[PDB]
Coordinates of C-alpha atoms and ligand atoms in Angstrom, one line a residue:
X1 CA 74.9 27.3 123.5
X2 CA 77.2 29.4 126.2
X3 CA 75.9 32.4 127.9
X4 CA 77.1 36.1 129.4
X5 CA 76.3 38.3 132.7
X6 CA 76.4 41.5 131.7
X7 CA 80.0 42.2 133.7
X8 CA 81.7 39.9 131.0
X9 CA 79.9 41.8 128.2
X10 CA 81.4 45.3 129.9
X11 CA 84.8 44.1 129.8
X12 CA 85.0 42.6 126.3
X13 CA 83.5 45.9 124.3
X14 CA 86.5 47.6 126.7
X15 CA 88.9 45.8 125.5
X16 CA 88.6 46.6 122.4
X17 CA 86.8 50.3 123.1
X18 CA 88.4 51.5 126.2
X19 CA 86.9 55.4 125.1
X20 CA 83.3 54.0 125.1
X21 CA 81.7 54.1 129.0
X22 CA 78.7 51.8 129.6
X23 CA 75.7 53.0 132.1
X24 CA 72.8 50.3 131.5
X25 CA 72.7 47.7 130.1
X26 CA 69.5 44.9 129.6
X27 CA 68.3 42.1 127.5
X28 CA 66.9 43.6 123.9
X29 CA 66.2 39.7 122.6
X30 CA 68.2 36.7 121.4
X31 CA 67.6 34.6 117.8
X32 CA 68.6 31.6 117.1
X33 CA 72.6 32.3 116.9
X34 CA 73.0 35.8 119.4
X35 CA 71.9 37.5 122.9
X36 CA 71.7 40.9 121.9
X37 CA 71.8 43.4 124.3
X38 CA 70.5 46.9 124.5
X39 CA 73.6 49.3 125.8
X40 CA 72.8 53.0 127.0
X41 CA 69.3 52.7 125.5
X42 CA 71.0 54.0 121.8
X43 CA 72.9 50.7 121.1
X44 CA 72.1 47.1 120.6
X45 CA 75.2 44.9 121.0
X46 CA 74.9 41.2 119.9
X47 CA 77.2 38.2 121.5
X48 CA 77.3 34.7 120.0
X49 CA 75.7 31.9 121.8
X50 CA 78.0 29.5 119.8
X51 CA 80.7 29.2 117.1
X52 CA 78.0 28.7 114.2
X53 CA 75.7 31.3 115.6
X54 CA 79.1 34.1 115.6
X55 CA 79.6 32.9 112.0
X56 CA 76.4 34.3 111.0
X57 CA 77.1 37.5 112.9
X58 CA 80.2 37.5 111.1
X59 CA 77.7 37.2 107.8
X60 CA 75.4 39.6 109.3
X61 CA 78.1 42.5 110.1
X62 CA 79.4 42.1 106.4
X63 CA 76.6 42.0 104.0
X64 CA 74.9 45.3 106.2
X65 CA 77.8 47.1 105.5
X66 CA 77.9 46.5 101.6
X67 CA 74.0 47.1 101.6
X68 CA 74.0 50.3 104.4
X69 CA 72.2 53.3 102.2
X70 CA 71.0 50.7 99.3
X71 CA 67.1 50.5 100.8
X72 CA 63.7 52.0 101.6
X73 CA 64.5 51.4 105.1
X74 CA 66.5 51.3 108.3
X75 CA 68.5 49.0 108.5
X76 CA 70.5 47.8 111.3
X77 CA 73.8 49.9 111.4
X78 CA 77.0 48.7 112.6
X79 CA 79.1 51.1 115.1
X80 CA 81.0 48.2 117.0
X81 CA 83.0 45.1 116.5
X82 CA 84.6 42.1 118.2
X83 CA 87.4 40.2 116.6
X84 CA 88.0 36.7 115.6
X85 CA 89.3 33.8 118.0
X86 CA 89.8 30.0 117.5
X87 CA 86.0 29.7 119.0
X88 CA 84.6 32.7 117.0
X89 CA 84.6 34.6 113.7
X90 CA 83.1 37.3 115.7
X91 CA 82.8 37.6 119.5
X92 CA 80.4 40.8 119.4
X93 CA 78.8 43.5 117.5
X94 CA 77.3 46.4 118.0
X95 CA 74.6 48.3 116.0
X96 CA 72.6 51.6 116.3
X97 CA 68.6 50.5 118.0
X98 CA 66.4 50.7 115.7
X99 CA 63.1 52.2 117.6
X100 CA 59.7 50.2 117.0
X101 CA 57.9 47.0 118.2
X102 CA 57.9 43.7 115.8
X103 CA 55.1 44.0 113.6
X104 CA 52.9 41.1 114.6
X105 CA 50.1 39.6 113.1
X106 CA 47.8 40.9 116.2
X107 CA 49.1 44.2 115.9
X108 CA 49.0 44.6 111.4
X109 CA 45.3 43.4 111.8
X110 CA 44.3 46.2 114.3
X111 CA 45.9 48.8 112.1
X112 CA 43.1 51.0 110.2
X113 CA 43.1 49.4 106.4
X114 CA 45.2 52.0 104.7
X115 CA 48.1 51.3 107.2
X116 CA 47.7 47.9 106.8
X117 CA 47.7 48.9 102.9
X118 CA 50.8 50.9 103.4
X119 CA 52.3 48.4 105.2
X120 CA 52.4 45.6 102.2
X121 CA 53.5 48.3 100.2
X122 CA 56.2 49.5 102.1
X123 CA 57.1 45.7 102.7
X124 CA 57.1 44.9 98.8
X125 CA 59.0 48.2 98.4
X126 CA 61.7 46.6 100.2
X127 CA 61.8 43.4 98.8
X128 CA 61.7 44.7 95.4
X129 CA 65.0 47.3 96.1
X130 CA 66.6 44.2 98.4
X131 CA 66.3 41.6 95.5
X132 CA 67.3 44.4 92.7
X133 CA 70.8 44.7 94.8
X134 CA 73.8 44.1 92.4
X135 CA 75.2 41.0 93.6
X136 CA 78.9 40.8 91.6
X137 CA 81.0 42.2 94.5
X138 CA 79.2 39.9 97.0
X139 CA 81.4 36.5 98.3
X140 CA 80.6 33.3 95.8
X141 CA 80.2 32.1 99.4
X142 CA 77.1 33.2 100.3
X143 CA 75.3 31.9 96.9
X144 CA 73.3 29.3 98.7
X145 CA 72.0 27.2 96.1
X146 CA 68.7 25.2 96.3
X147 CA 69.1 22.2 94.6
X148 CA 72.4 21.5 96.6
X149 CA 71.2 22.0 100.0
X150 CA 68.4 19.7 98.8
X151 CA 70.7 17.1 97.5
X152 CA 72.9 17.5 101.0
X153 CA 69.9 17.2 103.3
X154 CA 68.9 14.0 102.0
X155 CA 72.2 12.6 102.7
X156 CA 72.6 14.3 106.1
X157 CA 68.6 13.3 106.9
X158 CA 69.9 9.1 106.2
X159 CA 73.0 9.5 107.8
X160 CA 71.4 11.2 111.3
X161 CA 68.7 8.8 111.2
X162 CA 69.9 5.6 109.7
X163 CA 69.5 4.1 113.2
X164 CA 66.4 5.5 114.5
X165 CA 64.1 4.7 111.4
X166 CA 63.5 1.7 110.3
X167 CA 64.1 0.5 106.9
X168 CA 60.4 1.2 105.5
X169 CA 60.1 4.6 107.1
X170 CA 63.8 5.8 105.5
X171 CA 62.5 4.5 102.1
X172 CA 59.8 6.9 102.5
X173 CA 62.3 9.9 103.6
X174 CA 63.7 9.2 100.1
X175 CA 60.7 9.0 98.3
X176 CA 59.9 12.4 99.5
X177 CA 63.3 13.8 99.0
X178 CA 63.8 12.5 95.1
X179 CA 59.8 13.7 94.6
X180 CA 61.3 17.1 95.6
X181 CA 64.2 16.4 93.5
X182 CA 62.3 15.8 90.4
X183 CA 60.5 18.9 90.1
X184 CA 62.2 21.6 88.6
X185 CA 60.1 24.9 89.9
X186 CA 61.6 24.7 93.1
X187 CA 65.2 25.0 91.6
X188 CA 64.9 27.4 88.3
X189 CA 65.3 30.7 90.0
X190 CA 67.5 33.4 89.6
X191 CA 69.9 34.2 92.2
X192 CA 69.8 37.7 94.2
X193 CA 70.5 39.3 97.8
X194 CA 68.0 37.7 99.9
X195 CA 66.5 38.5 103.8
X196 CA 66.1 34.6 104.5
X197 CA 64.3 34.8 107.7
X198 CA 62.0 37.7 106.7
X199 CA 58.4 37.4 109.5
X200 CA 57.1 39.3 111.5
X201 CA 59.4 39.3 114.5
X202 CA 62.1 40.9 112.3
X203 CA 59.7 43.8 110.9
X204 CA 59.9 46.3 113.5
X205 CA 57.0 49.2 113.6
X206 CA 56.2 53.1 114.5
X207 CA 52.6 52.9 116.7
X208 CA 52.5 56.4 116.4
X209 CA 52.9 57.2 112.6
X210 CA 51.5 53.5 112.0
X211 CA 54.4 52.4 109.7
X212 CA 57.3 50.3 109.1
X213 CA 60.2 52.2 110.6
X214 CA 62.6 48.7 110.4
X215 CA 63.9 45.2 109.2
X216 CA 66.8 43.8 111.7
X217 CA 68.3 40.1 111.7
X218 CA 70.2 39.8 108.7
X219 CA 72.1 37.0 110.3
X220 CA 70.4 34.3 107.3
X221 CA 70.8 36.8 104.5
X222 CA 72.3 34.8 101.3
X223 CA 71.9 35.4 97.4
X224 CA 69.2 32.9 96.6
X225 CA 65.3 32.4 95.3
X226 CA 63.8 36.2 96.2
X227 CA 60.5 34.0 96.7
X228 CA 61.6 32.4 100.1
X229 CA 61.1 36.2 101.4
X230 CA 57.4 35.6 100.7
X231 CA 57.2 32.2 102.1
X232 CA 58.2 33.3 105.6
X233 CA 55.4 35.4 105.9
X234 CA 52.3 33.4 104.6
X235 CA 52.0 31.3 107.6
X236 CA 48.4 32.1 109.1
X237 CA 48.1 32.5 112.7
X238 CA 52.2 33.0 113.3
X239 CA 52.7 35.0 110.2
X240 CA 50.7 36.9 108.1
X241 CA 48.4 34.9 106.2
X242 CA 47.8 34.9 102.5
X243 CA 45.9 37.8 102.0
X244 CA 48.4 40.3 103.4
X245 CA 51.2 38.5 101.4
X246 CA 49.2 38.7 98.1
X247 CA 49.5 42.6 98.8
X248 CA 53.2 42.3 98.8
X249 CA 53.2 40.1 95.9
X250 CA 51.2 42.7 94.0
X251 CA 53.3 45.5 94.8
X252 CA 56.1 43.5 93.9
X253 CA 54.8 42.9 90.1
X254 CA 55.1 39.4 91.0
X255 CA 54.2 37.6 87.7
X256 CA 54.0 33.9 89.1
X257 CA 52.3 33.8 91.9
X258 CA 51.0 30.0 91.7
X259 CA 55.1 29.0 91.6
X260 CA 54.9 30.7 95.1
X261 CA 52.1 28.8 96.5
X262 CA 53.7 26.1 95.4
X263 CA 56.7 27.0 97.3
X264 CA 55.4 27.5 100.8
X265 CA 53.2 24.1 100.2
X266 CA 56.4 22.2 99.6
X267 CA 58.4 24.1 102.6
X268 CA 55.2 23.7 104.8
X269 CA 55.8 19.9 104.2
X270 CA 60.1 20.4 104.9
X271 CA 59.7 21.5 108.1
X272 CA 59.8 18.6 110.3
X273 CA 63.0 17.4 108.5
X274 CA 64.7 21.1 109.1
X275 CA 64.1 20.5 112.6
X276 CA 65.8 17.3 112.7
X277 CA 68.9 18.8 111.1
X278 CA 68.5 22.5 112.4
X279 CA 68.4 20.4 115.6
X280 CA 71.7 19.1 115.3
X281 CA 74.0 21.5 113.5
X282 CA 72.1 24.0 116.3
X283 CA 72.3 21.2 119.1
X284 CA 68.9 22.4 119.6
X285 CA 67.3 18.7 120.9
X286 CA 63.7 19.8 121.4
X287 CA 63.4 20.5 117.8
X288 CA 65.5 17.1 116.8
X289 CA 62.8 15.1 119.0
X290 CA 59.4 16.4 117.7
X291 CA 60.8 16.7 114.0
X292 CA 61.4 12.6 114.8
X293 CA 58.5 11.9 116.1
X294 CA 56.5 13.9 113.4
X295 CA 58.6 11.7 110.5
X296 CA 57.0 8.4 112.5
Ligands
GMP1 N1 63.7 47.1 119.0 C1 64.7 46.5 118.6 N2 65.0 45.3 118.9 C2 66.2 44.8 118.4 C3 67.1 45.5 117.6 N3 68.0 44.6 117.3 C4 67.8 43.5 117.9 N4 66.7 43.5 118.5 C5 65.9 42.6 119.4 O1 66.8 41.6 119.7 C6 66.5 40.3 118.8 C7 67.6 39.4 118.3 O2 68.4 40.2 117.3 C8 65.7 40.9 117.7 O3 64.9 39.8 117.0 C9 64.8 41.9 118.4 O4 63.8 41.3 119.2 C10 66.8 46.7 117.3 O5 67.5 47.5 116.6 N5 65.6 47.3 117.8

Protein backbone atom coordinates (compact mmCIF):
# COMPACT_ATOMS: atom_id res chain seq x y z
CA UNK A 1 0.00 0.00 0.00
CA UNK A 2 1.61 3.65 -1.07
CA UNK A 3 0.31 6.84 0.29
CA UNK A 4 -0.36 10.79 -0.83
CA UNK A 5 0.01 14.38 1.05
CA UNK A 6 -2.42 16.28 -0.17
CA UNK A 7 0.27 18.63 -2.42
CA UNK A 8 0.73 15.52 -4.68
CA UNK A 9 -3.01 14.95 -4.91
CA UNK A 10 -3.28 19.01 -6.12
CA UNK A 11 -0.92 18.56 -8.82
CA UNK A 12 -2.12 15.24 -10.35
CA UNK A 13 -6.14 16.38 -10.76
CA UNK A 14 -4.06 19.64 -12.42
CA UNK A 15 -2.54 17.86 -14.68
CA UNK A 16 -5.13 16.65 -16.14
CA UNK A 17 -7.76 19.63 -15.01
CA UNK A 18 -5.75 22.70 -15.13
CA UNK A 19 -9.47 24.85 -15.15
CA UNK A 20 -10.48 23.13 -11.88
CA UNK A 21 -8.89 25.33 -8.61
CA UNK A 22 -8.69 23.50 -5.27
CA UNK A 23 -9.34 25.38 -1.76
CA UNK A 24 -9.55 22.48 0.96
CA UNK A 25 -8.95 19.62 0.90
CA UNK A 26 -9.26 16.57 3.98
CA UNK A 27 -9.49 13.03 4.51
CA UNK A 28 -13.41 11.78 3.66
CA UNK A 29 -12.28 7.80 4.40
CA UNK A 30 -10.28 5.09 2.76
CA UNK A 31 -11.58 1.19 1.98
CA UNK A 32 -9.72 -1.47 1.39
CA UNK A 33 -8.29 -0.47 -2.23
CA UNK A 34 -8.50 3.88 -2.09
CA UNK A 35 -7.87 7.16 0.23
CA UNK A 36 -10.65 9.20 -0.83
CA UNK A 37 -10.58 12.62 -0.28
CA UNK A 38 -13.10 15.30 0.21
CA UNK A 39 -12.23 18.40 -2.30
CA UNK A 40 -13.99 21.88 -1.76
CA UNK A 41 -16.55 20.24 0.48
CA UNK A 42 -18.74 19.26 -2.97
CA UNK A 43 -16.26 16.53 -4.30
CA UNK A 44 -14.89 13.32 -3.12
CA UNK A 45 -11.77 12.36 -5.07
CA UNK A 46 -10.41 8.69 -4.58
CA UNK A 47 -6.51 7.74 -5.18
CA UNK A 48 -5.36 4.07 -5.22
CA UNK A 49 -3.41 2.74 -2.40
CA UNK A 50 -2.04 0.00 -4.88
CA UNK A 51 -2.25 -1.47 -8.37
CA UNK A 52 -5.10 -4.03 -7.42
CA UNK A 53 -6.94 -1.44 -5.33
CA UNK A 54 -6.86 1.25 -8.80
CA UNK A 55 -8.14 -1.84 -10.75
CA UNK A 56 -11.25 -1.77 -8.76
CA UNK A 57 -11.52 1.94 -9.11
CA UNK A 58 -11.20 1.35 -12.60
CA UNK A 59 -14.32 -1.33 -12.04
CA UNK A 60 -15.94 1.16 -9.81
CA UNK A 61 -15.76 4.31 -12.37
CA UNK A 62 -17.19 1.96 -15.17
CA UNK A 63 -20.09 -0.04 -13.90
CA UNK A 64 -21.48 3.62 -12.06
CA UNK A 65 -21.59 5.06 -15.26
CA UNK A 66 -23.64 2.28 -17.11
CA UNK A 67 -25.91 2.19 -13.98
CA UNK A 68 -26.10 6.33 -13.24
CA UNK A 69 -30.12 7.00 -13.42
CA UNK A 70 -31.00 3.07 -13.27
CA UNK A 71 -31.91 3.20 -9.14
CA UNK A 72 -34.04 4.33 -6.26
CA UNK A 73 -31.05 6.11 -5.09
CA UNK A 74 -27.99 8.33 -5.18
CA UNK A 75 -25.43 6.96 -6.33
CA UNK A 76 -21.95 8.01 -6.41
CA UNK A 77 -21.55 10.23 -9.58
CA UNK A 78 -18.43 10.49 -11.43
CA UNK A 79 -17.21 14.20 -12.50
CA UNK A 80 -13.30 13.40 -12.61
CA UNK A 81 -10.85 10.95 -13.95
CA UNK A 82 -7.12 9.90 -13.81
CA UNK A 83 -5.64 7.85 -16.60
CA UNK A 84 -3.93 4.70 -16.83
CA UNK A 85 -0.06 4.08 -16.19
CA UNK A 86 2.17 0.84 -16.05
CA UNK A 87 1.34 0.94 -12.09
CA UNK A 88 -2.41 1.82 -12.49
CA UNK A 89 -5.60 1.33 -14.47
CA UNK A 90 -6.62 4.44 -12.80
CA UNK A 91 -4.60 6.85 -10.77
CA UNK A 92 -7.77 8.96 -9.42
CA UNK A 93 -11.30 9.66 -9.57
CA UNK A 94 -13.48 11.96 -8.64
CA UNK A 95 -17.28 11.83 -7.71
CA UNK A 96 -19.98 14.36 -6.56
CA UNK A 97 -20.31 13.86 -2.11
CA UNK A 98 -23.00 12.33 -1.37
CA UNK A 99 -24.37 14.09 2.01
CA UNK A 100 -25.23 11.62 5.01
CA UNK A 101 -23.54 9.59 7.77
CA UNK A 102 -23.10 5.55 7.28
CA UNK A 103 -26.08 4.03 8.61
CA UNK A 104 -24.84 1.99 11.53
CA UNK A 105 -26.31 -0.55 13.50
CA UNK A 106 -26.30 2.02 16.63
CA UNK A 107 -27.83 4.60 14.73
CA UNK A 108 -30.85 2.18 12.58
CA UNK A 109 -31.73 0.90 16.13
CA UNK A 110 -32.36 4.49 17.60
CA UNK A 111 -34.51 5.44 14.66
CA UNK A 112 -38.40 5.48 15.69
CA UNK A 113 -39.86 1.94 14.14
CA UNK A 114 -41.43 3.31 10.99
CA UNK A 115 -37.93 4.73 9.91
CA UNK A 116 -36.39 1.72 10.71
CA UNK A 117 -39.45 0.15 8.61
CA UNK A 118 -38.71 2.58 5.84
CA UNK A 119 -35.36 1.95 5.93
CA UNK A 120 -35.51 -2.07 5.00
CA UNK A 121 -37.90 -0.96 2.49
CA UNK A 122 -36.05 1.45 0.93
CA UNK A 123 -33.00 -0.94 1.22
CA UNK A 124 -34.93 -3.91 -0.52
CA UNK A 125 -36.20 -1.32 -3.02
CA UNK A 126 -32.75 -0.99 -4.04
CA UNK A 127 -31.69 -4.35 -4.15
CA UNK A 128 -34.64 -5.46 -6.07
CA UNK A 129 -34.05 -2.48 -9.00
CA UNK A 130 -30.02 -3.23 -8.60
CA UNK A 131 -30.44 -7.03 -9.27
CA UNK A 132 -33.33 -6.45 -12.01
CA UNK A 133 -30.44 -4.36 -14.05
CA UNK A 134 -30.01 -5.82 -17.64
CA UNK A 135 -26.79 -7.23 -17.58
CA UNK A 136 -26.03 -8.04 -21.67
CA UNK A 137 -23.99 -4.89 -22.35
CA UNK A 138 -21.97 -5.45 -19.13
CA UNK A 139 -18.01 -7.01 -19.63
CA UNK A 140 -18.12 -11.08 -19.55
CA UNK A 141 -15.33 -9.97 -17.19
CA UNK A 142 -17.03 -9.02 -14.33
CA UNK A 143 -19.26 -12.41 -14.15
CA UNK A 144 -17.64 -13.69 -11.09
CA UNK A 145 -18.68 -17.10 -10.80
CA UNK A 146 -19.06 -18.98 -7.47
CA UNK A 147 -18.11 -22.34 -8.05
CA UNK A 148 -14.85 -21.14 -9.77
CA UNK A 149 -13.55 -18.89 -7.18
CA UNK A 150 -14.44 -21.85 -4.92
CA UNK A 151 -12.45 -24.32 -6.98
CA UNK A 152 -9.50 -21.54 -7.20
CA UNK A 153 -9.33 -20.81 -3.48
CA UNK A 154 -8.78 -24.25 -2.57
CA UNK A 155 -5.79 -24.41 -4.76
CA UNK A 156 -4.44 -21.00 -3.76
CA UNK A 157 -5.40 -21.94 0.23
CA UNK A 158 -2.68 -25.47 -0.42
CA UNK A 159 -0.30 -23.65 -2.34
CA UNK A 160 0.02 -20.46 0.34
CA UNK A 161 0.03 -22.79 3.12
CA UNK A 162 1.55 -26.07 2.01
CA UNK A 163 4.46 -25.21 4.35
CA UNK A 164 2.89 -23.81 7.34
CA UNK A 165 0.19 -26.61 7.96
CA UNK A 166 0.96 -29.74 8.54
CA UNK A 167 -0.10 -32.63 6.66
CA UNK A 168 -3.33 -33.54 8.96
CA UNK A 169 -4.40 -29.93 9.26
CA UNK A 170 -4.31 -29.42 5.14
CA UNK A 171 -6.31 -32.61 4.84
CA UNK A 172 -8.84 -30.97 6.86
CA UNK A 173 -8.67 -27.56 4.57
CA UNK A 174 -9.71 -30.02 1.87
CA UNK A 175 -12.32 -31.68 3.63
CA UNK A 176 -13.92 -28.43 4.13
CA UNK A 177 -13.35 -27.16 0.67
CA UNK A 178 -14.80 -30.44 -1.28
CA UNK A 179 -17.83 -30.44 1.56
CA UNK A 180 -18.44 -26.95 0.09
CA UNK A 181 -17.88 -28.29 -3.22
CA UNK A 182 -20.51 -30.89 -2.98
CA UNK A 183 -23.41 -29.02 -2.25
CA UNK A 184 -25.09 -27.47 -4.96
CA UNK A 185 -27.24 -24.46 -3.24
CA UNK A 186 -24.37 -22.43 -2.90
CA UNK A 187 -23.64 -22.58 -6.78
CA UNK A 188 -27.34 -22.72 -8.62
CA UNK A 189 -28.02 -19.02 -8.80
CA UNK A 190 -28.71 -16.79 -11.47
CA UNK A 191 -26.29 -14.27 -12.34
CA UNK A 192 -27.20 -10.34 -12.07
CA UNK A 193 -25.53 -6.85 -11.20
CA UNK A 194 -24.47 -7.21 -7.69
CA UNK A 195 -23.30 -4.45 -4.76
CA UNK A 196 -20.75 -7.11 -3.28
CA UNK A 197 -19.73 -5.26 -0.24
CA UNK A 198 -23.18 -4.04 0.64
CA UNK A 199 -23.05 -3.12 5.14
CA UNK A 200 -23.61 -0.65 6.85
CA UNK A 201 -20.61 1.55 6.30
CA UNK A 202 -21.57 1.93 2.66
CA UNK A 203 -25.34 2.96 3.38
CA UNK A 204 -25.14 6.50 3.99
CA UNK A 205 -28.18 8.33 5.87
CA UNK A 206 -30.28 11.87 6.18
CA UNK A 207 -30.62 12.48 10.37
CA UNK A 208 -32.90 14.98 9.56
CA UNK A 209 -35.58 13.38 7.24
CA UNK A 210 -34.50 9.85 8.84
CA UNK A 211 -33.87 8.11 5.58
CA UNK A 212 -31.57 6.53 3.20
CA UNK A 213 -30.23 9.33 1.08
CA UNK A 214 -27.04 6.93 -0.34
CA UNK A 215 -25.09 3.71 -1.32
CA UNK A 216 -21.26 4.54 -2.27
CA UNK A 217 -18.32 1.84 -2.71
CA UNK A 218 -19.03 0.09 -5.76
CA UNK A 219 -15.47 -0.82 -6.01
CA UNK A 220 -16.62 -4.98 -5.51
CA UNK A 221 -19.66 -4.64 -7.64
CA UNK A 222 -19.76 -7.94 -10.11
CA UNK A 223 -22.80 -9.85 -11.79
CA UNK A 224 -23.20 -12.76 -9.38
CA UNK A 225 -25.64 -14.50 -6.63
CA UNK A 226 -28.07 -11.23 -5.65
CA UNK A 227 -28.15 -13.18 -2.15
CA UNK A 228 -24.53 -12.19 -1.14
CA UNK A 229 -26.14 -8.57 -0.91
CA UNK A 230 -28.11 -9.96 2.06
CA UNK A 231 -25.28 -11.83 3.62
CA UNK A 232 -23.30 -8.71 4.27
CA UNK A 233 -25.67 -7.35 6.35
CA UNK A 234 -26.96 -10.15 8.74
CA UNK A 235 -23.93 -10.05 10.86
CA UNK A 236 -25.26 -9.08 14.48
CA UNK A 237 -23.38 -6.59 16.47
CA UNK A 238 -21.25 -5.26 13.17
CA UNK A 239 -24.15 -5.45 10.78
CA UNK A 240 -27.60 -5.56 11.12
CA UNK A 241 -28.83 -8.64 12.55
CA UNK A 242 -31.41 -11.02 11.25
CA UNK A 243 -34.38 -9.29 12.08
CA UNK A 244 -33.73 -6.13 10.06
CA UNK A 245 -32.48 -8.32 7.04
CA UNK A 246 -35.69 -10.42 7.12
CA UNK A 247 -37.40 -6.88 6.42
CA UNK A 248 -35.36 -6.59 3.32
CA UNK A 249 -35.87 -10.08 2.38
CA UNK A 250 -39.62 -9.50 2.65
CA UNK A 251 -39.70 -6.43 0.63
CA UNK A 252 -37.72 -8.12 -1.79
CA UNK A 253 -40.42 -11.09 -2.40
CA UNK A 254 -37.59 -13.25 -1.47
CA UNK A 255 -39.07 -16.80 -1.98
CA UNK A 256 -36.11 -18.83 -0.37
CA UNK A 257 -35.15 -17.49 2.46
CA UNK A 258 -33.66 -20.81 4.30
CA UNK A 259 -31.08 -20.99 0.93
CA UNK A 260 -29.96 -17.61 2.51
CA UNK A 261 -29.38 -18.68 5.92
CA UNK A 262 -27.70 -21.20 4.55
CA UNK A 263 -25.50 -18.91 2.74
CA UNK A 264 -24.30 -16.56 5.51
CA UNK A 265 -23.74 -19.89 7.74
CA UNK A 266 -21.46 -21.29 5.17
CA UNK A 267 -19.55 -17.68 4.52
CA UNK A 268 -19.61 -17.10 8.39
CA UNK A 269 -17.45 -20.43 8.38
CA UNK A 270 -15.14 -18.96 4.99
CA UNK A 271 -13.94 -16.18 6.62
CA UNK A 272 -10.82 -17.08 8.20
CA UNK A 273 -9.63 -18.66 4.86
CA UNK A 274 -10.58 -15.12 3.00
CA UNK A 275 -8.34 -13.61 5.32
CA UNK A 276 -5.51 -15.73 4.53
CA UNK A 277 -5.86 -15.06 0.84
CA UNK A 278 -7.38 -11.44 1.06
CA UNK A 279 -4.24 -11.18 3.13
CA UNK A 280 -1.99 -11.86 0.43
CA UNK A 281 -3.37 -10.66 -2.91
CA UNK A 282 -3.94 -7.35 -0.44
CA UNK A 283 -0.55 -7.79 1.36
CA UNK A 284 -2.64 -7.09 4.20
CA UNK A 285 -0.41 -9.47 6.97
CA UNK A 286 -2.55 -8.86 10.07
CA UNK A 287 -5.38 -10.54 8.47
CA UNK A 288 -2.93 -13.49 6.89
CA UNK A 289 -1.73 -14.07 10.60
CA UNK A 290 -5.05 -14.35 12.60
CA UNK A 291 -6.85 -16.22 9.55
CA UNK A 292 -3.62 -18.80 10.31
CA UNK A 293 -3.89 -19.08 13.49
CA UNK A 294 -7.73 -19.40 13.52
CA UNK A 295 -7.18 -22.56 10.73
CA UNK A 296 -4.83 -24.21 13.71
N1 LIG B 1 -20.15 11.03 3.31
C1 LIG B 1 -19.55 10.50 2.29
N2 LIG B 1 -18.46 9.75 2.46
C2 LIG B 1 -17.91 9.22 1.34
C3 LIG B 1 -18.37 9.43 0.08
N3 LIG B 1 -17.57 8.72 -0.75
C4 LIG B 1 -16.63 8.15 -0.03
N4 LIG B 1 -16.85 8.44 1.25
C5 LIG B 1 -16.15 8.04 2.54
O1 LIG B 1 -14.89 7.58 2.05
C6 LIG B 1 -14.86 6.07 2.20
C7 LIG B 1 -14.06 5.23 1.16
O2 LIG B 1 -14.76 5.35 -0.08
C8 LIG B 1 -16.35 5.69 2.24
O3 LIG B 1 -16.52 4.36 2.79
C9 LIG B 1 -16.91 6.80 3.10
O4 LIG B 1 -16.54 6.62 4.50
C10 LIG B 1 -19.47 10.19 -0.11
O5 LIG B 1 -19.98 10.43 -1.21
N5 LIG B 1 -20.07 10.76 0.99
Amino acid sequence: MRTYTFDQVEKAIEQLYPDFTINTIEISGEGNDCIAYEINRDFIFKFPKHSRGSTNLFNEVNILKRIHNKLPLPIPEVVFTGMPSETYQMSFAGFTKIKGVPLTPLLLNNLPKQSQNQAAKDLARFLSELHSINISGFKSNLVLDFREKINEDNKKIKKLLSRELKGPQMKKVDDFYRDILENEIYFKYYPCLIHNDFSSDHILFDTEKNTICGIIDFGDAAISDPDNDFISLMEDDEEYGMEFVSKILNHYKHKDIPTVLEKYRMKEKYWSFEKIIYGKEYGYMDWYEEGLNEIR
